[PDB]
């Protein structure tokens, strides 16, 4: 059932919020499901911000290890945040909008915050980490989503990440692919200082009626120029960096395996090594299938156009 996810069960949410399973595991939340509406709104806000960072709130819910997102809304930022934080008259519009949604139907409460990084990638800065750590202390089920309007245009695919922080003092396990990202020199220092204080969630969608309609319409409308070359992957950057990350991860796994071959009776090492190899394989397979799809479209369209008759 495509529309099953849109059903809101208030008592079930209250039961989950009373249970607090995330207190039993700091890696509890692993997946982030984002609605088409949410994605579109967030991307539009980020690109209207242009080269300036904007932010908003995300409405949604939790389901097992998965955090869901549905909505998002701007807060009065008089004089581009002339006061502390991008809030000013924040919950003024927020609480009104919230009571108004309890009135017109929307009952999904705050599930997180989104912020934009125009032209400098998706990750959490020191300020972002402090903000998310605070959000993980009051509204425990919160997620820091970062978007990139400039990379959305450059690479073609929307650059989006979902993140959760670790509590002060707590160390992550050895397991950690950590995809490589191009970070400008004015941001790389802060990135490196805080990159191990949080982790990235797996961001996934679920199709839907919102998708079906939106996608079909805009697609036909603007894709009459269906060519757009055919390979926006031609830019080395993305592909090259992904392949480099894969190589690094696999070489690290090999170094581990070589040292673990001496220790007889370490099952955990074998477990993490197998998992890392498997993650590397799936990442490579997704890249390969994307390239294959691009080639398929290119070949079909080019053959149709050039020598049809």
């Amino acid at each position: 059932s495509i529309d099953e996810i849109y059903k809101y069960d208030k008592k079930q949410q209250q039961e989950i919020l009373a249970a607090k399973p995330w207190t039993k595991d700091h890696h509890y939340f692993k997946y982030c499901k984002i609605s088409a509406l949410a994605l579109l709104k967030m991307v539009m806000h980020a690109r209207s911000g242009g080269n300036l960072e904007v932010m908003g709130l995300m409405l949604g819910k939790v389901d097992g290890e998965t955090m869901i997102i549905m909505d998002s809304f701007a807060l009065p930022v008089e004089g581009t945040e002339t006061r502390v934080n991008a809030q000013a008259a924040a919950y003024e519009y927020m609480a009104a909008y919230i009571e108004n949604a309890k009135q017109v139907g929307r009952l999904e409460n705050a599930i997180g915050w989104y912020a934009s990084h125009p032209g400098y990638g998706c990750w959490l800065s020191g300020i972002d980490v402090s903000t998310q750590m605070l959000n993980q202390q009051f509204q425990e089920p919160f997620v820091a989503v970062v978007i990139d309007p400039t990379r959305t245009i450059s690479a073609g695919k929307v650059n989006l990440g979902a993140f959760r922080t670790y509590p002060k003092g707590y160390k992550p396990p050895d397991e950690g692919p950590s995809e490589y990202q191009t970070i400008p020199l004015n941001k790389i220092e802060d990135f490196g200082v805080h990159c191990k204080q949080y982790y990235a969630l797996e961001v996934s969608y679920f199709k839907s009626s919102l998708d079906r309609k939106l996608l079909e319409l805009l697609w036909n409308k603007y894709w009459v120029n269906t060519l757009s070359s055919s390979s926006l992957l031609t830019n080395a950057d993305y592909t090259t960096g992904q392949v480099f990350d894969l190589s690094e991860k696999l070489e690290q796994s090999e170094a581990q395996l070589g040292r673990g071959s001496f220790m007889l009776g370490l099952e955990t090492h074998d477990r993490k090594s197998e998992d890392k190899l498997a993650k590397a394989t799936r990442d490579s397979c997704k890249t390969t299938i994307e390239a294959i799809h691009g080639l398929m479209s290119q070949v079909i369209k080019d053959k149709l156009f050039n020598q049809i008759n």
Binding site: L215, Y222, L277, T281, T288, N306, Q307
Partner: protein, 288 residues
């Protein structure tokens, strides 16, 4: 009849995907909350420059059914009007939207309550239970006609267009890509080929229209449409785009590169399967 006959559009209406997206979400949740597809009512905001109207955003409105008529909480609408002022001042109210088929004798009641608020409101109706391949969205304006000696408000369909910024085009395009390829590589080329299939259908429809026009001109119509016919001849001259040695060499080069990448990906998948098999094989019989 609430539809005006012989009345042409006086203003140009520009619609954005966000407006359609808001209507779809509003209809879905109300259907989920109250079973049957309950009709939804909202408001339209955006920028208007003279006779050019651009609907950029849209929010939902409160509706109270009393005495079998829909009463819109304009005070809630007015409460929300200053709410959207705090975030966006460039956007001005343009009209209201609803869901359903043909106009009913309840939308005229709703539209007149929107006509008293602002000078010229716009009426938009979406059909979520459509079956054709066309867009089930129509924009209607308010017109006053003398029917049987009494001034009756009617709806005149407007030939609206679709306005979209580079950012919205790219973001929704990524939305299309996220449906084409499933999260766990589900329905990989299902929506992919269907996308090119629909593009080819559009091109074939254009071709069949041109061919039908030519066949009709062969028998009747204008014997020589001048510009049109000459340009169509020159355009088929481009059907065999035709190439040289260098273009074919580059095409084969790209094909070979992508084929090598595909071979590498298949090798990676095969070696992962081999690793899993060896891990199990070290378990079932082998020790250490």
């Amino acid at each position: 009849s609430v539809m005006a006959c012989g009345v042409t559009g006086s203003v140009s209406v520009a619609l954005h995907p966000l407006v359609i997206l808001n209507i779809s979400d509003h209809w879905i949740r109300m259907r989920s909350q109250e079973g049957r597809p309950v009709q939804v009512i909202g408001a339209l905001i955006g920028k208007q420059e003279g006779r050019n109207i651009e609907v950029m955003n849209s929010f939902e409105l409160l509706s109270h059914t009393v005495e079998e008529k829909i009463i819109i909480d304009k005070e809630y609408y007015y409460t929300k009007e200053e709410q959207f002022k705090q975030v966006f001042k460039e956007l001005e109210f343009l009209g209201w939207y609803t869901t359903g088929g043909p106009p009913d004798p309840s939308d005229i009641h709703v539209h007149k309550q929107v006509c008293e608020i602002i000078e010229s409101p716009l009426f938009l109706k979406l059909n979520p239970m459509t079956k054709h391949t066309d867009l089930p969205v129509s924009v209607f304006e308010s017109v006053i006609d003398i029917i049987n000696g009494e001034a009756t408000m009617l709806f005149a369909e407007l030939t609206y267009t679709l306005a979209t910024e580079e950012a919205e085009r790219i973001g929704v395009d990524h939305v299309a890509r996220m449906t084409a390829t499933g999260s766990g590589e589900n329905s990989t080329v299902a929506e992919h080929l269907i996308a090119q299939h629909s593009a080819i259908k559009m091109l074939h429809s254009r071709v069949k229209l041109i061919l039908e026009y030519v066949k009709a001109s062969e028998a009747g119509e204008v014997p020589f449409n001048h510009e049109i016919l000459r340009e169509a001849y020159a355009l088929c001259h481009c059907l065999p785009v035709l190439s040289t040695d260098k273009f074919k060499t580059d095409f084969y080069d790209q094909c070979n590169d992508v084929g090598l990448m595909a071979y590498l990906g298949t090798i990676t998948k095969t070696c992962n399967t081999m690793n899993q098999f060896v891990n199990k094989f070290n378990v079932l019989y082998d020790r250490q």
